[PDB]
Design a protein around this ligand. Structure first.
Ligand SMILES: [Ca+2]
Lengths: 235, 59
């Protein structure tokens, strides 16, 4: 996250970090005690992944961290149906052992299709993660967060040569300087509704980071909430 | 009706009969007594900060 601020411990208790062949390579959000939602591009069918909830500073021990192994990965069925489009960039991760919910490990709420869209349209959401804090620069040690405004579809479409599908939305500032970035993928874009946060998007892709005239592209969660609920039921 | 200020519902609203509304909440919450607000029904309901933050107030 470029141009953001340090989160306070427990401020985004749904946020998780994914570790694998590369450390702290993507983020995710807690759906329930056994499931994480992230971006499909982060989880290339094959390699082993670990999830850490209750994380704050990646180089220190807070004694709030809960590490779990991923035993099953479900990328959306239409991701990579086409090549290099980033469409349907969303995936679900099943944990080997249930997370233990507490003040530092709490799920993000997920509304139905209609309300998730209503919440996104409020027009202001938070993005967070441990990704780059500068275009082509170092990754964050302490979780970063940033409030970003929704960008109207035409300006969105008009800002890039790449196709922005109906499963995506743009968010960011006209002047640039503040944006999600590499390493932040899979993290949540969330909308606070009277003190309760709802998942409205997944950090997905962009061109460089925080450049003026460019915006972050996000997976539109409203289009996928039925799928998230069908796959993450606990027995 | 749900048209104005979400029917006064803290979370979800649905138009019912005779121009009136029925509020509901997401998982982990229950509709309060006033029929509009959402209160936690589990110890750690989704989407809320419970560390509360800081250590210097009346609390
Ligand atoms: Ca730590």
């Amino acid at each position: 996250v470029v141009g953001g601020e340090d989160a306070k411990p427990g401020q985004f208790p749904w946020q998780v970090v994914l570790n694998g062949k590369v450390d702290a390579f993507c983020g995710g959000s807690i759906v329930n005690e056994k499931w994480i939602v992230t971006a499909a591009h982060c989880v290339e069918t094959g390699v082993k992944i670990t999830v850490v909830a209750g994380e704050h500073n990646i180089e220190e021990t807070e004694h709030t961290e809960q590490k779990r192994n991923v035993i099953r990965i479900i990328p959306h069925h239409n991701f990579n149906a086409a090549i290099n489009t980033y469409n349907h960039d969303i995936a679900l991760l099943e944990l080997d052992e249930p997370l233990v919910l507490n003040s530092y490990v709490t799920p993000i709420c997920i509304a139905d299709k209609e309300y998730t869209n209503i919440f996104l349209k409020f027009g202001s959401g938070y993005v967070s993660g441990w990704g780059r804090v500068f275009h082509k620069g170092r990754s964050a040690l302490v979780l970063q967060y940033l409030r970003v405004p929704l960008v109207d579809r035409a300006t969105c479409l008009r800002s890039t040569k790449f196709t922005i599908t109906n499963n995506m939305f743009c968010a960011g500032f006209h002047e640039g300087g503040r944006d999600s970035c590499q390493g932040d993928s899979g993290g949540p874009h969330v909308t606070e509704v009277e003190g309760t946060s709802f998942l409205t998007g997944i950090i997905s892709w962009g061109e460089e980071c925080a450049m003026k005239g460019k915006y972050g592209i996000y997976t539109k969660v409203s289009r996928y909430v039925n799928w998230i609920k069908e796959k993450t039921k606990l027995t | 009706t749900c048209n104005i200020k979400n029917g006064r519902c803290e979370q979800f609203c649905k138009n019912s009969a005779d121009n009136k509304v029925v509020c509901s909440c997401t998982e982990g919450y229950r509709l309060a007594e006033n029929q509009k607000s959402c209160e936690p029904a589990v110890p750690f309901p989704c989407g809320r900060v419970s560390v509360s933050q800081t250590s210097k107030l009346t609390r």
